Design a protein around this ligand. Structure first.
Ligand code: CYC
Ligand code: CYC
Ligand code: CYC
Ligand code: CYC
Ligand code: CYC
Ligand code: CYC
Ligand code: CYC
Ligand code: CYC
Ligand code: CYC
Lengths: 65, 172, 160, 162, 49, 159, 213, 160, 159, 172
């Protein structure tokens, strides 16, 4: 139900003067429904995905998630 | 060793649900055709030894090289192996007719016959002819009405022709 | 997940339907669900008094509430009240579901690492949860009290 | 499995002889017995829900401690009572199996083989299912010759429990 | 108007052109407001702006 | 109805409402009748599925036409298995009181699935409507209203 | 009647003398005439169950009350007693419904004679006798064989003769065969299949009309 | 990245310009790019039929599509269709680039951990990708078929 | 191709690229041949539409079956009009070089439309494939590659 | 059937030399830990039947399809196979603990278990899981001190956890 993600996304636009440490490197909990498109956004931005982990869910659950 | 009844039982057993009414109705029909099943099984074992010798002569004419020297059924000892073992098809066929199922036929008389011949040198082709020469005479013995009441058993005699065809095609 | 959805999921992994064993489990769940509803009302009555009595019995006048403890600061005390309150609310939810997996997936997912990283003591939380268990067992009743205590002890065992 | 058709078959197999009139008369005895036994099975399959509800409640009123005593073996929790209707729901299948098969084959192969073997280990008292079957013996509601046919397999299971 | 409220609360700009209102009508109608909110936060303009 | 009430009170910050606890009490009170309806539908699995499928082929002969999807014994057996699956999900929904078991087992992505299988959606829907009519004829009257309204959810959600 | 099929014997650990003088991992091969007690006969009656059926199928329901009583009385010789277990229809349903004829040779040699079969051609050799003589007649020819009566003797429970480095036979051979297992997978009752709906799909009548333009 | 940008990056790490060896690689890439364009059109023609034939050849009527399998549920079946549709689309992109690094960076970054955490079987995906490879090799042609199969086998080797 | 290049350089902050200006120059250079292909397809409107529709009814007789949608003279006339519309959009896409005229006139919401009309999508797609085959036989060879690849976009986008 | 002693004997027989001094120093340590060996083995057989039933319920919950119909352990005869049998692992494990060597465990209970299941249809993995449910309870039974003198046996209990892990990994 909840994924534990950890990914880096570099800056391929112009360089930013704000620190932006979190954007470059983050670890966040994403729900299962949003995770496909949110991954696809990191897929688009050319960033590496380091660590994917199921936080809450169990594999192979047919009912009740 | 399975029946028509225990066929339905072991099929309903896996599901874990009690047998349906429709299935039961079908088994009530097997009770009604139960007396015709004893008509057909009693007619074969009465003509058992007469149909072994009669199918043997028609086999050993039409393949003369068997009792000719060098043949697989040449000497008097092997010849009795073949002649008397033609009962063992009929022993396990009339078991399956009275059972109404081909489970007893499969694990005794069918499970290793096509196995045992490569080590034995008995030709596979010869077996197909011999049992198939039993089938047209065993059906013809149970077909004709003489001193029995007339009925219809074409849906039941086709089971017997299926049993020999199961016994024939599993070897040759 | 409920007890009903747990029964359905167990039968679905088997691939069969709901026959008499699962039906008898469902009849059992319905018979206890009546008193479960009554206990949910009587717990939602005085949840604040339950948390107040629990912290007054267990956490107050100790070293952790003194200067030099985890519950010294006013924001830390409010986080303790909220945390204690959450354990009561989610034990109520797990009581009404008849199933602790929703409770586990909700809080016991990350509360171990959170209390590890923040330096929150585990055993004081276990004592506070036990005090909640005693207060709710005295307030509600015997059998609904131990039904509440099963999931509260599940929380306390998951934190440990 | 054991069936008085196959009882006639396996007996003629060891002697190595054809199906004479000795084995043949055992068949008809099974055949006309089915017509008083198949609607004896229809009386149980139509009343399936009734009896497993009836026998389970009859066990609790006979043994009132089995609902209160804490243990896996007992019916204190919900999954015990869920396993309660599974067990007596499993008995009524084999009785309908052994009525339809016409012999004690499925009672032998599926129920009573090792039945006294497991009950020593899981401390399930067999007198629990004795009173369970005796409620089914009195509440079946079957009548006539067919009823008698459904009555023996209940009593054949009781003597296997004891 | 719900769509302009969404773009204004999450972003502060609210509509740019009629065509994005068109493309958000279908996202509202298929599942509800939550799918359209997730489509707003999926959009690359939120990450740039 | 417990899962839906809990997640609805989870979206808010508050507990379960007295109204919702009345809903759970009424659901418990009707649960035994719902188990009786599930008992009848479990035991009538065969003939309900066959009558509904044959009513479908009476209404829609395009599927069993040789240009259609359900042409042949194996394809029509899978057709009847699909109707069996949907009747099983209807029994689950009658027992639970929610439609979340029906939804997250058989509703949520069925359009894209039957688009990729080449199967028409409307004939599935007509078969489930035939199941609704058959199970309505089998059961008691307002009990059939209860069963047919879950069937009605499945029919309206497939189209 | 007809003499048996002539079979070549292979090299086997018991066919020859071997100069092991009593090793420890060798069986305790029991005798009836030692007993003189209540006590000894309960252990001896258990080891013959452990041989012919196997440990797993040694349950109380299968066991025969009449046979056990006879051994204590001593009316029946242990060699006459093993005939009870081999011709027991409680034994016969467990092994003859589930095993083919050539496996029925191998299992009887492996347990009763306590020896491995020599080759494949001798299970073929014993096979003809079983079909004609029945299961009882093949067992009767095995126990009254000269090989069985000389080496086990008259009152000694079956056992494996030589196993210097050889598998125990109970472990080595399953009660049932590899064939009968494949039937159990075929009648598993798969769930959610198209095959169980095939007999229902042919009963439904479907009419199709095609238009050409 | 392309084959062109790969050639440019290799020459840039060397620090030299594009002389005759790199130019001959570029002429080779142009000569195969014609048939690559034709194969992209004939793949984008019937991608849905390719995925349909692949799942009908490999995944249907098995244990995973039966109750008690990974592809039992309707949302799981739709996720399977969209994953195979992806593998075909990204193998088309990697065919037109002439370079598998964009394909690797796009999907093989995290699909291993995702199929690990969700419990998705790997070998059934490898069989499905092989069925896609056979269907596209039968549909397109010989040399463009094996050009497609190189990147499809790259996907199947990256998942394993 | 000018609109797509302009909106693509609009999403960025920069002007049109030299690569994109080469694309526009090559599109201008091929534009006269594209007008010739549009001339041939305009003048072959009748027989192309009729041959493609009759090839469709040879392949798929379910639509003109009496259970099907295109049963009757008026329904089959609207079928041929739909094929006429799609051939018109294919000519627009051949002229423009983009597929944005094909898309925003006839692709973008066609699945929901033909779902609500009761019409199968795959038979539309098979008819446009028949149009592709017919217009491929009429034109010059690599000119037919050009026309059939826009037809290929329409076919793949309908399914 | 080998010991720790006859392990050293048969190893020293192959080299054909006398027994070295440190080997007798190592075997003198086995004499000192000999009384700790007796207590652990004795404890298991006192809790033998309690740990068979307790590991059976944890197995048949977490794989419910076994006692469900169609399962390999569905019927009672089969069920009294998988349950009683679970003693036979423990019969040959506690032989090996008292022997101090895995030779008796290998040629009786390990030499054909992964063999016999392909012909039987029993699931090897499920059996392996069951033995791994014995191991964490058999170690936990011998670990806790109640009414015994306190000692250290972590170098000896790890032999028991190795014996179940030898029994588990040779099958699944
Ligand atoms: C007959 C049409 C052909 C034929 C028969 C034949 N067979 C043998 C030898 C054997 N036959 C069997 C057959 C069975 N054994 C079984 O257990 C069963 C099922 C119950 C069957 C059908 C076996 C095992 C043998 C081996 C020896 C034996 O009798 O025990 C012979 C004798 C051959 C010989 O002695 O070398 C013969 C003649 N052979 C033919 O020529 C016919 C074509
Ligand atoms: C405000 C606190 C803070 C810091 C310091 C910070 C650093 C930071 N440096 C980065 C990259 C980088 N950092 C460097 C740095 C160097 N290269 C060298 O050879 C030198 C050793 C060193 C320069 C002195 C380079 C070259 C990159 C880009 C590498 C790439 O192309 O991916 C990135 C990745 C995204 C990006 O900016 O491109 C972050 C987040 N972020 C923060 O929030
Ligand atoms: C076990 C001892 C036993 C036997 C043998 C037996 C046979 C038997 N066969 C019967 C009928 C019959 N049997 C047959 C059989 C056939 N007719 C044909 O033309 C076919 C070729 C053939 C089947 C292949 C028919 C047609 C009838 C008519 C009556 C009926 O349906 O039973 C009946 C009806 C009652 C009667 O005849 O008095 C009997 C008794 N009943 C017994 O108790
Ligand atoms: C197919 C034929 C078949 C039947 C019927 C069968 C019954 C059976 N019931 C068992 C346990 C049980 N049986 C019951 C049932 C009851 N206990 C009670 O308290 C009630 C009085 C009663 C029900 C009315 C319960 C609650 C358990 C679990 C006990 C335990 O885990 O210790 C067990 C041992 C553990 C198991 O696998 O679940 C078996 C083998 N097994 C079979 O193979
Ligand atoms: C529990 C939720 C659920 C559903 C609904 C489901 C459907 C389902 N239907 C299938 C095939 C099929 N389904 C149909 C269906 C139909 N024939 C028609 O024309 C009618 C409209 C419709 C009958 C309702 C046909 C004809 C096939 C065979 C198609 C093929 O084999 O390509 C298949 C692939 C083969 C299989 O695994 O059985 C699945 C998975 N699976 C599920 O797990
Ligand atoms: C574009 C590059 C890319 C890919 C490939 C991708 C895959 C991907 N597949 C997923 C799930 C899934 N993937 C499968 C796949 C399969 N099941 C099987 O048995 C087969 C072996 C295989 C189908 C051929 C299934 C069944 C799920 C859903 C499992 C669940 O219910 O949680 C998920 C989790 C969210 C979801 O879509 O439901 C992602 C993110 N994401 C991406 O960004
Ligand atoms: C330019 C983009 C565009 C398209 C595509 C379009 C289609 C379109 N097709 C229609 C009907 C129809 N369309 C079909 C189509 C077909 N018969 C089949 O089976 C085949 C799969 C398919 C032929 C390709 C049929 C049979 C009808 C009549 C249905 C009815 O009258 O209810 C209608 C309603 C009546 C009308 O106004 O003509 C529209 C608007 N309109 C548009 O503006
Ligand atoms: C001394 C070493 C030794 C072992 C361990 C051994 C096992 C063994 N177990 C067997 C059967 C069996 N084994 C089991 C055990 C299981 N099946 C299940 O369902 C469970 C998953 C599992 C237990 C956890 C069962 C139930 C049977 C009876 C199966 C049958 O009769 O077909 C059989 C074949 C029949 C027999 O004689 O009982 C052997 C040879 N034999 C040996 O000589
Ligand atoms: C064959 C029958 C038999 C048994 C069973 C037996 C056991 C046994 N264990 C003993 C000691 C002992 N046994 C243990 C065992 C342990 N303590 C721990 O804390 C550990 C967890 C565990 C080992 C894993 C210890 C620590 C002692 C102390 C005395 C000694 O060293 O022998 C002693 C010393 C004498 C006595 O206790 O009266 C006996 C008798 N003696 C026998 O004749």
């Amino acid at each position: 139900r909840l994924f534990k993600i950890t990914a880096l996304v570099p800056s391929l636009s112009r360089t930013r003067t704000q620190r932006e440490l979190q954007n470059t490197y983050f670890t966040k909990l994403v729900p299962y429904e949003n995770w496909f498109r949110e991954q696809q956004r990191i897929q688009k931005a050319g960033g590496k995905i380091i660590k994917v982990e199921l936080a809450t869910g169990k594999q192979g659950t047919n009912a009740g998630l | 060793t399975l029946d028509v009844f225990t066929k339905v039982v072991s099929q309903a057993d896996s599901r874990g649900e009690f047998l349906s009414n429709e299935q039961l109705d079908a088994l009530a029909n097997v009770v009604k055709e139960g007396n015709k099943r004893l008509d057909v099984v009693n007619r074969i074992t009465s003509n058992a030894s007469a149909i072994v010798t009669n199918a043997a002569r028609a086999l050993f004419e039409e393949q003369p090289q068997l009792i000719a020297p060098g043949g697989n059924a040449y000497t008097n000892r092997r010849m009795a192996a073949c002649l008397r073992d033609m009962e063992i098809i009929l022993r396990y066929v009339t078991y399956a007719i009275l059972a109404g199922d081909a489970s007893v036929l499969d694990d005794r008389c069918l499970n290793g016959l096509r196995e045992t011949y490569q080590a034995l040198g008995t030709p596979g082709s010869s077996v197909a002819v011999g049992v198939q020469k039993m089938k047209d005479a065993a059906v013809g013995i149970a077909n004709d009405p003489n001193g029995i009441t007339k009925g219809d058993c074409s849906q039941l005699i086709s089971e017997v022709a299926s049993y020999f065809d199961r016994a024939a095609a599993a070897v040759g | 997940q409920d007890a009903i959805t747990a029964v359905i999921n167990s039968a679905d992994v088997q691939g069969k339907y709901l026959d008499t064993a699962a039906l008898e489990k469902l009849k059992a769940y319905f018979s206890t669900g009546e008193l479960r509803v009554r206990a949910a009302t009587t717990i939602s009555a005085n949840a604040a008094a339950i948390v107040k009595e629990a912290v007054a019995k267990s956490l107050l006048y100790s070293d952790i509430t003194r200067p030099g403890g985890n519950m010294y600061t006013t924001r830390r005390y409010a986080a303790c009240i909220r945390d204690l309150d959450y354990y009561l609310r989610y034990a109520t939810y797990a009581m009404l579901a008849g199933d602790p997996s929703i409770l586990d997936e909700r809080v016991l997912n990350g509360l171990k690492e959170t209390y590890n990283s923040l330096g929150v003591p585990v055993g004081a939380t276990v004592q506070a949860i036990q005090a909640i268990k005693e207060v709710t067992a005295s307030l509600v009743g015997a059998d609904a009290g131990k039904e509440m205590g099963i999931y509260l002890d599940y929380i306390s065992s998951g934190l440990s | 499995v054991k069936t008085p058709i196959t009882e006639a078959i396996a007996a003629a197999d060891t002697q190595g002889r054809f199906l004479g009139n000795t084995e043949l008369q055992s068949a008809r005895g099974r055949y006309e017995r089915a017509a008083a036994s198949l609607e004896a099975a229809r009386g149980l399959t139509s009343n399936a829900q009734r009896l497993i509800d009836g026998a389970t409640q009859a066990v609790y009123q006979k043994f009132p401690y089995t609902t209160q005593t804490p243990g896996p073996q007992f019916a204190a929790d919900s999954r015990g009572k869920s396993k309660c209707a599974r067990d007596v729901g499993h008995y009524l299948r084999i009785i309908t199996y052994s009525l339809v098969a016409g012999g004690t084959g499925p009672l032998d192969e599926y129920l009573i083989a090792g039945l006294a073997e497991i009950n020593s280990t899981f401390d399930l008292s067999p007198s629990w299912y004795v009173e369970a079957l005796k409620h089914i013996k009195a509440n079946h509601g079957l009548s006539g010759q067919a009823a008698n046919e459904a009555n023996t397999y209940i009593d054949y299971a009781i003597n296997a429990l004891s | 108007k719900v769509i302009e409220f969404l773009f204004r609360h999450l972003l502060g700009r609210a509509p740019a052109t009629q065509g994005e209102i068109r493309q958000y009508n279908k996202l509202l109608a298929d599942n509800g407001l939550r799918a359209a909110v997730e489509a707003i936060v999926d959009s690359p303009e939120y990450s740039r702006y | 109805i417990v899962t839906k009430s809990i997640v609805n009170a989870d979206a808010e910050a508050r507990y379960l409402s007295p109204g919702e606890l009345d809903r759970i009490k009424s659901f418990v009170a009707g649960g035994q009748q719902r188990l009786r309806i599930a008992q009848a539908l479990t035991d009538n699995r065969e003939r309900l599925v066959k009558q509904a499928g044959d009513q479908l082929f009476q209404k829609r002969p395009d599927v069993v036409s040789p240009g259609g999807n359900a042409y042949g014994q194996e394809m029509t057996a899978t057709c009847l298995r699909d109707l069996d699956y949907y009747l099983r999900l209807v029994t689950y929904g009658i027992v639970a009181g929610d439609v979340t078991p029906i939804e997250e087992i058989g509703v949520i992505g069925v359009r894209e699935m039957y688009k990729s299988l080449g199967t028409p959606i409307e004939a599935v829907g007509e078969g489930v409507r035939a199941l609704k009519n058959a199970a309505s004829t089998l059961l008691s009257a307002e009990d059939a209203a209860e069963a047919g309204s879950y069937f009605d959810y499945v029919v309206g959600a497939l189209q | 009647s007809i003499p048996l099929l002539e079979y070549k014997p292979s090299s086997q650990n018991q066919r020859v003398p071997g100069y092991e003088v009593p090793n420890e991992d060798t069986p305790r091969i029991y005798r009836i005439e030692d007993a003189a007690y209540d006590s000894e006969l309960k252990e001896l009656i258990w080891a013959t169950y452990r041989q012919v059926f196997s440990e797993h199928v040694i349950l109380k329901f299968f066991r025969q009350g009449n046979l056990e009583s006879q051994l204590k009385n001593r009316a029946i010789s242990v060699r006459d007693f093993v005939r009870g277990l081999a011709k027991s229809e409680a034994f016969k349903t467990l092994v003859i419904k589930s095993n083919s004829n050539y496996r029925l040779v191998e299992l009887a040699l492996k347990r009763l004679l306590g020896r491995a079969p020599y080759n494949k051609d001798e299970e073929i050799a014993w096979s003809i006798k079983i079909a004609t003589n029945g299961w009882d007649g093949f067992v009767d020819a095995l126990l009254d064989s000269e090989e069985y009566q000389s080496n086990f003797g008259e009152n000694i429970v079956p056992y494996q003769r030589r196993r210097y480095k050889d598998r125990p036979f109970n472990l080595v051979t399953p009660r049932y065969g590899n064939y009968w297992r494949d039937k159990l997978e075929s009648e598993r009752y798969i769930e959610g299949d198209i095959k169980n709906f095939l007999e229902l799909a042919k009963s439904i009548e479907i009419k199709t009309v095609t238009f050409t333009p």
